[PDB]
Symmetry: C4
Subunit: 335 residues, 4 copies
Amino acid sequence: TYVSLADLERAARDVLPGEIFDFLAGGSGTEASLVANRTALERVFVIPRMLRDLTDVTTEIDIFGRRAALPMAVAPVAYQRLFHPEGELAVARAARDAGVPYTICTLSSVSLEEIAAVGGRPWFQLYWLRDEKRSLDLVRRAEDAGCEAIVFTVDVPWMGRRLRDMRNGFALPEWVTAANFDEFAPATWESVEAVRAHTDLPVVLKGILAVEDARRAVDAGAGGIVVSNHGGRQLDGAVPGIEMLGEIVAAVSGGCEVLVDGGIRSGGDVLKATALGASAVLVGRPVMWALAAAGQDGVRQLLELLAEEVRDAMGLAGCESVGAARRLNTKLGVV
Amino acid sequence: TYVSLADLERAARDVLPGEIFDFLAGGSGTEASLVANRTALERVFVIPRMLRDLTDVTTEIDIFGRRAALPMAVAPVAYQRLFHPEGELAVARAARDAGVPYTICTLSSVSLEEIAAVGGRPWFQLYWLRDEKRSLDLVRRAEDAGCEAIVFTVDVPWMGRRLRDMRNGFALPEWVTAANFDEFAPATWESVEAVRAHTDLPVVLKGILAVEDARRAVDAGAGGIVVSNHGGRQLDGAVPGIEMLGEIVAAVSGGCEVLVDGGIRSGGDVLKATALGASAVLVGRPVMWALAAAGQDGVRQLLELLAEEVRDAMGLAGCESVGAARRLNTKLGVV
Amino acid sequence: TYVSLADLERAARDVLPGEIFDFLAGGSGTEASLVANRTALERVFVIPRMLRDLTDVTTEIDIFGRRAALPMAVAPVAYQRLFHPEGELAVARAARDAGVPYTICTLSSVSLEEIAAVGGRPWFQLYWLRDEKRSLDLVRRAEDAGCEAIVFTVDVPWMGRRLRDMRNGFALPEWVTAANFDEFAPATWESVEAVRAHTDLPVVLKGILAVEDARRAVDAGAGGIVVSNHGGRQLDGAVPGIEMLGEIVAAVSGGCEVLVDGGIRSGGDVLKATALGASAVLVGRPVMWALAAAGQDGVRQLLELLAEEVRDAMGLAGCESVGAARRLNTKLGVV
Amino acid sequence: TYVSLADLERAARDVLPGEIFDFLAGGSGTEASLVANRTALERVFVIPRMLRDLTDVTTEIDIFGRRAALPMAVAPVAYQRLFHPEGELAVARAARDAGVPYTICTLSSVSLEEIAAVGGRPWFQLYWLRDEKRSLDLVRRAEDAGCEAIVFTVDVPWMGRRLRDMRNGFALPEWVTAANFDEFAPATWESVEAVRAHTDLPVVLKGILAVEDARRAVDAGAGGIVVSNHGGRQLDGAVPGIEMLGEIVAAVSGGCEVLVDGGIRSGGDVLKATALGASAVLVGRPVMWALAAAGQDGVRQLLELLAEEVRDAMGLAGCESVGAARRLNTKLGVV
Ligand SMILES: Cc1cc2nc3c(=O)[nH]c(=O)nc-3n(C[C@H](O)[C@H](O)[C@H](O)COP(=O)(O)O)c2cc1C
Ligand SMILES: Cc1cc2nc3c(=O)[nH]c(=O)nc-3n(C[C@H](O)[C@H](O)[C@H](O)COP(=O)(O)O)c2cc1C
Ligand SMILES: Cc1cc2nc3c(=O)[nH]c(=O)nc-3n(C[C@H](O)[C@H](O)[C@H](O)COP(=O)(O)O)c2cc1C
Ligand SMILES: Cc1cc2nc3c(=O)[nH]c(=O)nc-3n(C[C@H](O)[C@H](O)[C@H](O)COP(=O)(O)O)c2cc1C
Ligand SMILES: O=C(O)C(=O)c1ccccc1
Ligand SMILES: O=C(O)C(=O)c1ccccc1
Ligand SMILES: O=C(O)C(=O)c1ccccc1
Ligand SMILES: O=C(O)C(=O)c1ccccc1
Ligand SMILES: O=C(O)C(=O)c1ccccc1
Ligand SMILES: O=C(O)C(=O)c1ccccc1
Ligand SMILES: O=C(O)C(=O)c1ccccc1
Ligand SMILES: O=C(O)C(=O)c1ccccc1
Ligand SMILES: [Mg+2]
Ligand SMILES: [Mg+2]
Ligand SMILES: [Mg+2]
Ligand SMILES: [Mg+2]
C-alpha cells in the first residue's frame, strides 16, 4: 500500500538505523542545495493541453540506443547493501523488470559483473581513479560486462562535507565493502577525453550545471549530460539542476541527451522536468527508501507507482508521448 | 449568521462524515494545484478608482443570452446528495431564487430533467461518453429540458489521482447514484465539433489553461471557455486558471466569454477575477459547504452573502457595472 | 519607557476593552490589505548615503503654507473618546506641542471648534454628507475655526465590511457621539469641485491609489493627495499606498503634495516613504495606542519617539533635510 | 569539535552573560537589516564549473600590499574584552597564526600598540574624533605601530539605536575601557581627504552602500571600500551589502579593492561573495563567538574551519584561485 513516494520515506525512516538514514537523506553544509532541489520543482507549474488524441499514450523513450519504459533511470547510489542485504541486486532486478535503466556504481557493494549479470541493459557510473590505467580498466570491465553507457561523475573532485555524517561519526560497517576493488583523483577534461577514446559506449557527464560546461561536454563528444547538483551533497549553495535545465537544453540544441536529477518525487515531477526539456530524469533517494522498506518488491512497487503517475500526468497534460511532453510550456509560481 | 465563506466551511466540517469532507476538499497528488489556486488569488491586488457615480450600481451581467444577477454561476459538482438529502434540488432552487445560473452535472445524483424543472435557466455539464451517440443523446436531453448552455468539461480524459480518497478507500454510498443513467472516453476536438454540430446552445469548454487552446476553442465555435485547473483535482502541478486568465482574455480578444474558477471565496475574489478580464466566475466547494451546513437555506445565505460582497467590492473600487470592473488594473504583491 | 511604537500597542492591548481594540486594529474582509501595508513597507530597503554634512540636520517641512516639525501628521481617526476620556483634545494638545498637524474628523467625538481652539494649526477631514449645502457648511465651520486644509476622504462611498466588528456586534457606546452633529452620500468629482469652489484652503484628497486618479486630482485643483488604502478598512484587496507611491509621485511631477499612509510604525518607515517620494506621512493606529495607553502624555511620548527615530534615520542615511531624503534610492528585497 | 560556525554561536550563548550576548548579536530598530544580511546570502546560488585543474588550489590573495591566507579579514569589533579576558590579544594572535588580517579598533579594550606588537600585519579601524588633529594622531599612532591599512568607518555619523541594549540598560563594565584613550564627530569627505593626505597607507572606506559613494571613494583616493550595512546595527532598513556588491564592483571597474561584510557564516558564503565580485570579506560576530567559547584556541579553530570550508567550496566550484572564483556566475533563487 503506497500511493505516493512519501509513503516509502516514512517506511524507510522506520526500519533504518538513524546514522544510515542520515547518510542517505543528508546534504553538504547547511543543506541549502538539498532543500532548493525541492523548492525549485515546487515553483514550476505545467500548462497542460486539452482534447488531444490519447488512444496510444506511451511513456517509452529511446536513449543511448535502447528503449526504456519510462523517461527515468535509477541514479547511481553507492553502497546499497547499507539499506538492504540484497543491496544492488534487489534494485537492479526490479529495474530490469520495470524496463528502467539501472546505474551500477564504481563504489557498489556488489561487483559490477554480478549486477550486470542480472540483465536489463545497465549503465556504469565512473569515479576517476588515481591513475588513468586503472580508471580505464574499470571502464573496460563495465563494457565487457554489457553496460551500455558510462556515466562519468564530474562534480566530485573530492567528496562534499556532509555534517550529519561528521556529527554521527558515520563510517562503513565492516559488512559493507567496495566490491569492485581488492586512490581517487579529480577528473578533468583530459580524463573525459581518455574515456571517450577508450570506449565505443556513450559517455554521459553527470554533475553539469554551467551552460558553457554543457556546451563543452557536447564539443568533447559526450552522448549525454546529467544536469545535477549531486542531490545537494557536493557544493552547498550550488544551484539546483532544474533551475539550469531550460538554459542548458537551449544551449546544446539537440547535440546530446540532457538528463536532470535532484528531488524528483512523483510522476508530476517527471512531467515538469520533461516540460523544461529533459530527455529523462534520474531518481536516487526514493529508490533507496523502497529498497530499505521492502527490498526488491519495494523497488518494484515504487517503479510501478512512478509508472502510473507518469502516465497519469502525461495524459492529463494532453501528451501521448514524451516528445509531446517536452513541448509543454511552464510558468513559475510562488511557494 | 455567516459573514464570510469561511464560516460555512467550518460548519460543513462539523456535519459531514470525514471521508465525504475529504472527497469535497481534496485535490490530486500533493495538492499543489489546489493550494496554488488560493495563493495565486492572494497575490493579486486591485487598484480601485474613486469619486465615480455609484447611483445605479448593478452586479448584473448578460451571458449566453440571459441576464444573471451576479457575474457568477454554480460550478458543476457531481453527486450533491453526498452533502445533503435534497442534493441538487436544494442547490438549484437557491440558485434560481438568487438569479444565478446552476450547472447540472452529467454525474448528478438527481436526474437532469428534475433539476431543470426547478426553473431558473440552468446549464448542463457534459462528460464525454463511450460512444458519440449516447453523448449526443445527453446533450439533446439537456436541451429538451430547457438547459441554456452546454458546459463541456475538457480537462478530464480520465479522473485525477485523489490520494485522500485512496487512503480513505472512499466510494459512493449505495444511496447515491448517477441519476442520469440506468463508459466514459477521453474527449477530443472532434468531440467538441460533434457537440457544436448537434446543438444550437452555446458550447462552453471548461478546463482550458493554454493560450493556444483558448484560441482554438474560439476557432472551434465555442461560445465560452472556463479557465480552470479543475479545483486542483486533475493534473497536480497544473497552473492556476487565475494565472493564465489575463493572457487568455487578451488572446481571444472578445471572441467568446471567458470564465474562471478555482478558489473564489469572496466578493473581493470575484472583483479580482473581473479585473483580470473574466466575464464571470464559477464557485464550487463553498456552495457545497453551504448545502452541507443548512441545505437550501444555507445555499441561499451563501449567495446573499456573495451578492453583498460583490456589490461592496465593486462600489469601493468605483465600479457601477461589471464592465467597469473589467477595466480595473491590478498589481501583483507578495504573500 | 517606550523605545518603539510596538511597546505602545502592547500597552493599549492591556487597557482597552477587546471590542474597542478590535474596532481600532481591524480591517475589512480577510484583512489582506491591512497585512499588505506592513508587508509592502518591510520589502523596501533604503540605500543610505555617507560622509555628508550633518551639522544642521532638520526634520522640518513646509506644507500647505505652514512649517511642520516632522514630515508627519496625525491621521483622521473617528471617535477618539473610544480610547481615552479626553479623546481628541488629548491628541490635538500633544500634536500641537510636538509641532505636528492634527486632522480633525467629521466624526469627531469632540466638536471641531473645541479641538481647533487647542491651537496648533489643525486640518479638517471631510466625509461627504447627504446634501451639498450641509457638506459645505461643515467646510465653512472648519475654515472659520482656523483649520488650514480640508482633507476630503474619497475612498468611502460607504464604509467597508469590518468582520471583527460584525462578529463582536460592535456599536458606539452611548457615551460617545458624533459631536459635530445634532445622512452620508458617496462623494464624486463634482463634490470635489463644490468644495474647491467654496474654500480658499488647500483641498487634499485622501484615499487615492490609481495613477490616473492622482493626475485627475491635480487637474481638479487639489493641493495634495494621500496615497492610501484606508488602513485596509475599505476595499479588502486594495493595493497598499506605499506600492503605488513612486508611480504616483512621478505622474503628478510636483503638481501637488503627495502624502502616504498605512502601516507607518517607525522613523525608518517615514524615511522609506520619503525615499519613495512622499512629502509627508499620516500615522493613525499608533497615535490611538499612545492615547489609550497614557492619554495626552502618551501621545507626547510617541511623537517624541518618532521625532528621534526620524532624525536618527535621516542622519544615518546622510540626509540633512527631508528634501535630501526624497532623493535617496531604494531597493526591493524579500520578506 | 566544531564542524560549522553555528556550533560556536551555541557555545558562546552558553557562556556569555545575556546582556553581553545581546550587545554582540543585536541590530538597530526592528533588526530588519540584520536579518536581511542572512536572507540576501541565502538567496544567492553559485553555478559551479567542473573538470578544471585543481592540482594547486590556493585560497591566498594579495591585498593592500600583503599576502593573506584566505580572502578574509577579522572585522573591527569594539571592546573584545567583553567576550574573553584576553580580548583583542587572543583574537590577533589567532589571526596572525592563520595568516588572516586583523582589524584593530579605535575603541579597542587593549591599546593598538599592544595589539600591533602581536605581529601578523594588522589593519587599523578609525572612528573620526572631535578635532582633526586627534583623529590624525590616531592614524599616525597606527602607522608608527606597523598597521598596514586604515579602515575608516564611514557609516557612523553617530551610533545606531540598538533596542536590545536599551531594554537591557546595557553599559560597559567598569573592567572594560577604551584603551587607546586617557568626543566623536561625524566624518565627511573632507575628513577622508585629511586622512588620505596624512598617510601613505591605503585608506579603506567601510560602510559604503550607494554606487555613487563607491565611485566617489575611488575618486577620493581610497585603496578599498567595504560594502556593508554595519551588521544591521546602524540604519535599520539599510540594504544588505551583498545586494549592492555586484553593482558596485561593476561601477568601480577595478579602481579599488571591494570587500563585503554582513552575515558571512561559512566558506560557501565566502565563495558567494567572491562570485559576486568581492576581493575579500570581513567576518565579525562569528570571531567573537569563537573568542567567547574558547579564547585564542577557539578563534584558531574557527579560522581553521573557515579555511577548510573555503578550500572545499572553491574546489567543488572548479576554482584553483580566488580570481577564478570571482569569474563564477550566480543565480538568485527563493528562500
Ligand atoms: C547515499 C547517496 C549515495 C550517492 N552515491 C553516488 C555515487 O556513488 N555516484 C554518483 O554519481 N552520485 C551519487 N549520488 C548522487 C545521486 O546519483 C543523485 O545525483 C542524487 O541523489 C540526487 O537525486 P535524488 O534527490 O533523487 O536523491 C549519491 C546520492 C546519495 C543520496
Ligand atoms: C467534489 C467535486 C466534484 C466535482 N465534480 C465536477 C464535475 O462533475 N464536472 C466538472 O466539470 N467539474 C467538477 N468539479 C470541479 C468544479 O466544477 C470546479 O472546477 C472546482 O471545484 C474549482 O472550484 P472551487 O475552488 O470553487 O471548488 C468538481 C469539484 C469538486 C470539489
Ligand atoms: C479606528 C479608525 C478610524 C478611522 N477613521 C477615519 C475617518 O474618520 N476618516 C478617514 O479619512 N480615515 C479614517 N481612518 C483611516 C486613517 O485615517 C488611516 O488612513 C489608516 O488608519 C491607515 O493608517 P495606520 O496604519 O497608520 O492606521 C480610520 C482608521 C481607524 C483605524
Ligand atoms: C559588537 C560589535 C561591535 C562592532 N564594532 C565596530 C567598530 O568598532 N567599528 C566598525 O567599523 N564596525 C564595528 N562593528 C561592525 C563589524 O565590523 C561588521 O561590519 C558587522 O559585524 C557585520 O559583520 P558580521 O555579520 O560578520 O558580524 C561591530 C559589530 C559588532 C557586532
Ligand atoms: O557520491 C555521493 O553522493 C556520496 O554519498 C558518497 C559518499 C561516500 C562514498 C560514496 C558516495
Ligand atoms: O577523497 C575523497 O573525497 C574520496 O571519497 C573520493 C571519492 C570519489 C571521487 C573523488 C574522491
Ligand atoms: O469531476 C470531479 O472534479 C471529481 O470530483 C469527480 C469524481 C468522481 C465522480 C465525479 C466527479
Ligand atoms: O475512468 C474515469 O476516470 C471516469 O471516472 C471518468 C469520468 C468522467 C470523465 C472521464 C472519465
Ligand atoms: O473611517 C474609518 O476608517 C472607520 O473606522 C469608521 C467607522 C465608523 C465610523 C467612522 C469611521
Ligand atoms: O453608510 C455608511 O457606510 C456610513 O457609515 C458612511 C460614513 C462615512 C462616509 C460614507 C458613509
Ligand atoms: O560600532 C558598532 O558596531 C557598535 O557595536 C559599537 C557600539 C558601542 C561602542 C563601539 C561600537
Ligand atoms: O555619539 C555617538 O553615537 C558615539 O558613540 C560615536 C561613536 C563612534 C562614532 C561616532 C559616534
Ligand atoms: Mg531526482
Ligand atoms: Mg472558484
Ligand atoms: Mg500610517
Ligand atoms: Mg560578515
